[PDB]
Design a protein around this ligand. Structure first.
Ligand code: HEM
Ligand code: HEM
Ligand code: HEM
Ligand code: HEM
Lengths: 141, 145, 141, 145
């Protein structure tokens, strides 16, 4: 459960990402399949080749989903229903995998925003992602 | 663990890493990001805040020791089990650090390199690095498994 | 996050516990200390002896917290504010410990309530105890 | 691992466990309690509700097989790593079960035995048993360590 400060820091961080949210989105997926190959077993129908337009377009979708979450930090369950439905009920994604993408995203954000990626922001973003992850991995419908 | 091809890339990039700075940053991020880890570092003094943590001299001092043992791990990369057997005995048997925390550090370590190197620390190069940090984590957790 | 069925289940099961919650709370603590000795390092000032006055007296406490939490399933952060402060800010409990206590409690409940401890009830209480542990380990001041 | 005692006490308790019924329950409680685990069990048919899962024949039968290798690892508590080497390879290399689930199952097994044996499953007997399912969860994870 996030502080007022954590939600402050998440908003701040996400303004900076701004319009490269899709870009960072793609890069984090790209880093996750590379670093953690088992995650690929969830995308058997994907072009998982380096530079695949398919991975790029999906990162757009994932970042677009996170930006929705940043605007609805007080009711993530409500915002992310349709997405829990997918991740928990239909896809049945092992919880550890959400750790792997979260880490990846953090890696991504760090390398593009060294100045803004302060340890405090790091802490808040970490909490944010663990919160999103709990949502997509609970069956609450 | 790594092939020869990967083991070289990892050694070249690691050569470029500023041990003073990176070790302290990683330790401090760890204390800041997973606040319960602070309980192992009470003696360390004021760890009330981010500013406090990051600027604590003992933190900075300790970070170095840690990165130093890592740099050594990077020299015995095929026998990490052996290289870390002492440290496994200390962290596990004496300190009682739960081994889930060793993953956290290695992960924090990865985010720090990426902060300090940006585009230089590539998807390709990070992947290889995650295998290192997992080995060292596994090696550290040896007294349990 | 809890579904409406999860809340029902917890309410129902926590009710069946009724007047035996202090006892079970004590049994859970004994079982955690015994199976997972590292947890005892959080109680160096306690007599963790079999049948301790102090363990028993604590087990009453932890159960009365969970009874209150069961009455406030909609607002655990609001309900458990002071207990987060203690467990999160003051004691800095490594979250692995919360898992070991939640396991311990479930093992207790199963042995005392075999007919009532269904896999549906078991699932709902698992998620409930995960929610509580999140709050108690969160710094949302 | 266990000592002479922890070992003979644990072995005795185990003689009282009906493997047929207890395996099916544990496997089913895994699938219901930690429902991402169902994704490994797609071929098993309908897993849509708790009753479906519990009443599923494929689950029970598989549950039987699960406890069998457990009874087995009880007969080889000394060398769990050797005991579980094939299953380690199958789960780890061919099914890619995150080792985290080995621990869940071991824990779910513990709660099942407590359910089935109530006070008989004493705090002291539950303890030696925790070392046992953690021993087992480590040998299967060996192709990750
Ligand atoms: C922060 C965590 C995550 C978020 C926000 C997220 C978000 C999304 C979003 C927005 C979609 C779009 C689907 C649509 O078009 O409606 C999606 C689809 C999907 N997500 Fe995730 N996801 C997350 C984590 C994961 C993880 C860890 C996995 C597996 C490792 C995963 C697997 C999938 C899959 C397999 C799809 C659909 C792929 C397909 O269309 O074939 N998601 N996810
Ligand atoms: C990659 C993981 C780690 C490595 C390589 C590592 C390495 C070391 C080294 C070299 C020392 C000091 C060696 C010596 O002083 O003889 C040390 C001490 C210590 N480590 Fe770590 N360590 C690691 C992880 C951790 C973690 C995750 C924690 C807790 C969060 C931890 C807690 C400690 C503590 C509490 C000390 C002693 C500090 C004191 O004097 O209070 N270690 N570790
Ligand atoms: C469901 C999880 C937990 C609940 C509901 C809970 C509840 C409580 C309560 C009500 C108190 C003290 C208030 C009082 O004593 O008057 C307390 C204190 C404490 N808790 Fe917890 N706690 C939980 C988890 C933990 C865990 C997992 C640990 C560590 C293993 C822990 C360690 C402590 C310690 C060391 C104290 C203070 C000791 C004392 O006052 O004697 N708590 N907890
Ligand atoms: C201690 C834990 C486990 C033990 C002792 C165990 C044991 C076994 C055994 C004996 C088999 C079948 C052997 C054979 O027919 O060749 C098996 C297969 C399987 N296990 Fe497990 N397993 C364990 C954990 C898990 C876990 C945690 C999962 C997933 C959550 C899992 C999923 C599977 C799957 C999908 C198969 C293939 C089953 C089939 O289609 O027949 N296992 N495991």
């Amino acid at each position: 459960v996030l502080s007022a400060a954590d939600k402050g820091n998440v908003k701040a961080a996400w303004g900076k990402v701004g319009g490269h949210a899709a870009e960072y989105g793609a890069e984090a997926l790209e880093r996750m399949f590379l670093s953690f190959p088992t995650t690929k077993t969830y995308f058997p129908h994907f072009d998982l080749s380096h530079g695949s337009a398919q991975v790029k377009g999906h990162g757009a979708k994932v970042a677009a989903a996170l930006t929705k979450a940043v605007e609805h930090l007080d009711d993530l369950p409500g915002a992310l229903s349709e997405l829990s439905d997918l991740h928990a009920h239909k896809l049945r994604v092992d919880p550890v995998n959400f750790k792997l993408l979260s880490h990846s995203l953090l890696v991504t954000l760090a390398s593009h925003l060294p100045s803004d990626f302060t340890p405090a922001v790091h802490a808040s973003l970490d909490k944010f992602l663990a919160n999103v992850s709990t949502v997509l991995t609970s069956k609450y419908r | 663990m790594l092939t020869a091809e990967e083991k070289a890339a990892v050694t070249a990039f690691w050569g470029k890493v500023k041990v003073d700075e990176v070790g302290g940053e990683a330790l401090g991020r760890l204390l800041v990001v997973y606040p319960w880890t602070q309980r192992f570092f009470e003696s360390f003094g004021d760890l009330s805040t981010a500013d406090a943590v990051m600027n604590n001299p003992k933190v900075k001092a300790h970070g170095k020791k840690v990165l130093d043992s890592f740099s050594n791990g990077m020299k015995h990369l095929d026998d990490l089990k052996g290289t870390f057997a002492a440290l496994s005995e200390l962290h596990c048997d004496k300190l009682h650090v739960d081994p889930e925390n060793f993953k956290l550090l290695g992960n924090v370590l990865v985010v720090v390199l990426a902060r300090n190197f940006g585009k230089e620390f590539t998807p390709v190069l990070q992947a290889d690095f995650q295998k290192v940090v997992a080995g060292v984590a596994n090696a550290l957790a040896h007294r349990y498994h």
